[PDB]
Amino acid sequence: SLKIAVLDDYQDAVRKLDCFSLLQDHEVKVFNNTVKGVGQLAARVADVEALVLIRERTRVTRQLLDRLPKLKIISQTGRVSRDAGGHIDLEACTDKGVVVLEGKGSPVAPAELTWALVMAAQRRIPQYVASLKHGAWQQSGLKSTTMPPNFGIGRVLKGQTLGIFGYGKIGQLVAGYGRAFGMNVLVWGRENSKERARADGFAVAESKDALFEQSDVLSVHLRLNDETRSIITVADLTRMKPTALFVNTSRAELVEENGMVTALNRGRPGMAAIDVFETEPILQGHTLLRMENCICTPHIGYVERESYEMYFGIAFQNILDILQGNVDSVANPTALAPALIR
Amino acid sequence: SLKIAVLDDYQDAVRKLDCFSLLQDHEVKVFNNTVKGVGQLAARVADVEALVLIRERTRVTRQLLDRLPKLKIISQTGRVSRDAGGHIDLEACTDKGVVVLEGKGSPVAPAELTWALVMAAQRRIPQYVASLKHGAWQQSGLKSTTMPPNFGIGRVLKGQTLGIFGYGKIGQLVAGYGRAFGMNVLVWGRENSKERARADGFAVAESKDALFEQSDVLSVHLRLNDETRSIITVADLTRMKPTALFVNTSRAELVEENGMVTALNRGRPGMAAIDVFETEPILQGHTLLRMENCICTPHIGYVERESYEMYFGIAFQNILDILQGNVDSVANPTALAPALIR
Numbered sequence: 130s131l132k133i134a135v136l137d138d139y140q141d142a143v144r145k146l147d148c149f150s151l152l153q154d155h156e157v158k159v160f161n162n163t164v165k166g167v168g169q170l171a172a173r174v175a176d177v178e179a180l181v182l183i184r185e186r187t188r189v190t191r192q193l194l195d196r197l198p199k200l201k202i203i204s205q206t207g208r209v210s211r212d213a214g215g216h217i218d219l220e221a222c223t224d225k226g227v228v229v230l231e232g233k234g235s236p237v238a239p240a241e242l243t244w245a246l247v248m249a250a251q252r253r254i255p256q257y258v259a260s261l262k263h264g265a266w267q268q269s270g271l272k273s274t275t276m277p278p279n280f281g282i283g284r285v286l287k288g289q290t291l292g293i294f295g296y297g298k299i300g301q302l303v304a305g306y307g308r309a310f311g312m313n314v315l316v317w318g319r320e321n322s323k324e325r326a327r328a329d330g331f332a333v334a335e336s337k338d339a340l341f342e343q344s345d346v347l348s349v350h351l352r353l354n355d356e357t358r359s360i361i362t363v364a365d366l367t368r369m370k371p372t373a374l375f376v377n378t379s380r381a382e383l384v385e386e387n388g389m390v391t392a393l394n395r396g397r398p399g400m401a402a403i404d405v406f407e408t409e410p411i412l413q414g415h416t417l418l419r420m421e422n423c424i425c426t427p428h429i430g431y432v433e434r435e436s437y438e439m440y441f442g443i444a445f446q447n448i449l450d451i452l453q454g455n456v457d458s459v460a461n462p463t464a465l466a467p468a469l470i471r
Numbered sequence: 472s473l474k475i476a477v478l479d480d481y482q483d484a485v486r487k488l489d490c491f492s493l494l495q496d497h498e499v500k501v502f503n504n505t506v507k508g509v510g511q512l513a514a515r516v517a518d519v520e521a522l523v524l525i526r527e528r529t530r531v532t533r534q535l536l537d538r539l540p541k542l543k544i545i546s547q548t549g550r551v552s553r554d555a556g557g558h559i560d561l562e563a564c565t566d567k568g569v570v571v572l573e574g575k576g577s578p579v580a581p582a583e584l585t586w587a588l589v590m591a592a593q594r595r596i597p598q599y600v601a602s603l604k605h606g607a608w609q610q611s612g613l614k615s616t617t618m619p620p621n622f623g624i625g626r627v628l629k630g631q632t633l634g635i636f637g638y639g640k641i642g643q644l645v646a647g648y649g650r651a652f653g654m655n656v657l658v659w660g661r662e663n664s665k666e667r668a669r670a671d672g673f674a675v676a677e678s679k680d681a682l683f684e685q686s687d688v689l690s691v692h693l694r695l696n697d698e699t700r701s702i703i704t705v706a707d708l709t710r711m712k713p714t715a716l717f718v719n720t721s722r723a724e725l726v727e728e729n730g731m732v733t734a735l736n737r738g739r740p741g742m743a744a745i746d747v748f749e750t751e752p753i754l755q756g757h758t759l760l761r762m763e764n765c766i767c768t769p770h771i772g773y774v775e776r777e778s779y780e781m782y783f784g785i786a787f788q789n790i791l792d793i794l795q796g797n798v799d800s801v802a803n804p805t806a807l808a809p810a811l812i813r
């Protein structure tokens with residue numbers, strides 16, 4: 130019987146999941162807000178032996194682990210990144226003999242979310258809905274002199290060009306949606322992405338430059354690492370059409386710092402839809418939130434009922450499996466060794 | 472050279488269209504708001520000989536035409552309905568010698584808008600967007616105590632049931648989007664609609680009861696006529712699951728008056744997304760508009776760039792064509808016979 134904490138559950142959804150009953154033999158506290166800074170966070174989880182993390186919402190540093198003597202298990206919803214950086218210091222965990230348990234993820238919820246944003250942006254749904262609530266009939270704004278003529282009006286997807294930057298599992302689903310809407314789908318990425326795209330019957334853009342020039346909607350599906358940090362520059366974005374939509378439900382740092390705000394202010398692309406920010410949560414506003422030609426959602430790509438059932442079901446079962454000596458989900462198995470060999 | 476007026480163009484889009492230059496030899500006035508008063512409407516359009524209407528935005532009554540001696544042409548964007556309802560009194564037009572020109576429609580823009588609402592509603596996009604703008608991180612604000620658990624978080628489409636009521640051109644497209652997202656499509660309608668659906672590979676409902684009970688998302692795709700008017704009752708809607716979404720982008724009058732409000736207030740369906748209203752424009756104090764579980768858009772289904780280019784292109788060409796004697800677009804051909812014979 131462990132003291133378990135689940136962090137960063139803003140809408141208090143975790144405790145209402147069918148899978149929550151998996152932890153019936155344990156004492157579970159779910160927190161509904163985020164605390165940053167080592168001191169306050171260590172005091173909040175001082176007695177917990179098992180910590181459940183929601184994706185990358187909280188980072189686990191050596192300095193945090195120094196302040197947590199009772200911690201035995203970190204159970205990660207979704208994948209644990211082995212690369213430099215990563216939101217969990219695995220070596221520091223291994224040093225304390227804290228096991229990190231790895232879950233599994235799914236591309237479906239964030240792919241559908243990507244498309245929901247494509248459709249919402251191209252039809253100016255948030256803008257029209259908000260205007261209507263304030264009494265303005267059929268008004269979406271977007272009528273500035275710097276903007277294209279009739280930019281406030283909806284745009285059809287059929288027969289337009291969809292650029293897909295990155296062809297992993299999410300990119301592949303979203304490319305499929307494009308095809309089913311009758312869009313002209315072009316893919317770009319590393320060599321193996323191009324190969325899998327060609328095998329799937331998708332056209333590959335001539336170059337990265339060609340992707341940004343030609344796309345009416347450009348959507349980014351890349352994992353963040355040293356190769357892809359700042360891979361999208363202001364030069365790339367300002368190559369985009371004045372009527373073009375830039376979509377990013379991946380990671381904010383894929384675009385060079387302030388690059389997006391900068392490009393929107395220069396009028397190319399014409400619109401953006403984003404789900405991810407450099408700093409989260411955003412409680413005190415953001416430049417992009419005050420722009421009528423940006424639609425921003427609060428990192429809801431994976432916030433979905435079936436996704437939570439699967440994600441937490443696995444993270445909770447992982448804790449149960451470890452307590453029975455099944456250590457298959459351990460990311461850092463050398464933390465199981467005695468302190469003498471550690 | 473005729474005096475032409477275009478009515479009800481709220482965002483002043485018509486004059487910025489490429490097809491607007493078809494009327495370069497004429498005097499065009501475009502109005503940007505709606506007057507319904509027969510006296511105020513007559514005074515606006517007192518000197519014009521050609522009237523271009525935007526779908527059903529303005530009603531043309533006998534008592535309107537009586538107050539308009541100079542009017543010769545009514546050019547309709549989209550189709551002209553010969554139904555007992557009908558927003559134009561075609562008989563009055565004939566009696567006054569006014570020719571009514573019928574245009575052509577397209578299912579693409581309203582089908583894509585339907586899907587945009589399905590996705591916006593299922594991921595609670597406007598709710599999350601508006602909350603974020605107000606400083607609430609990852610709150611959809613669906614704060615009812617009688618809603619299903621976790622109803623404030625998003626829901627994937629994959630694996631869910633898509634109910635389609637009516638299988639014309641728009642329903643066929645929406646069914647195709649359902650299939651593309653991995654939904655189980657369920658089609659209901661008249662025999663020939665059900666037959667076309669089975670041939671297209673879709674499951675069909677055995678009864679209207681089955682359609683309302685089994686759908687997770689239910690979308691209505693019927694034309695309004697003597698049989699489909701008030702075809703959806705409160706009793707239909709309260710057969711829907713408390714987790715279900717009802718979508719209506721077709722016509723408000725398919726649903727019995729106050730039926731949707733009543734049903735939503737009784738928790739069944741759990742949510743609605745509605746593009747069409749009994750009286751348009753609506754007022755800010757409209758009942759549905761106040762509801763957190765109703766996403767309301769201001770009849771934007773056909774308000775789209777390519778759609779406007781197509782619809783107005785045809786309507787403007789129709790005017791040009793009848794001025795040169797080509798009268799194929801005339802819906803009331805007997806209006807062309809001499810006043811003494813009328």
Ligand SMILES: [Cl-]
Binds near residue numbers: 770773
């Ligand atoms: Cl319309």
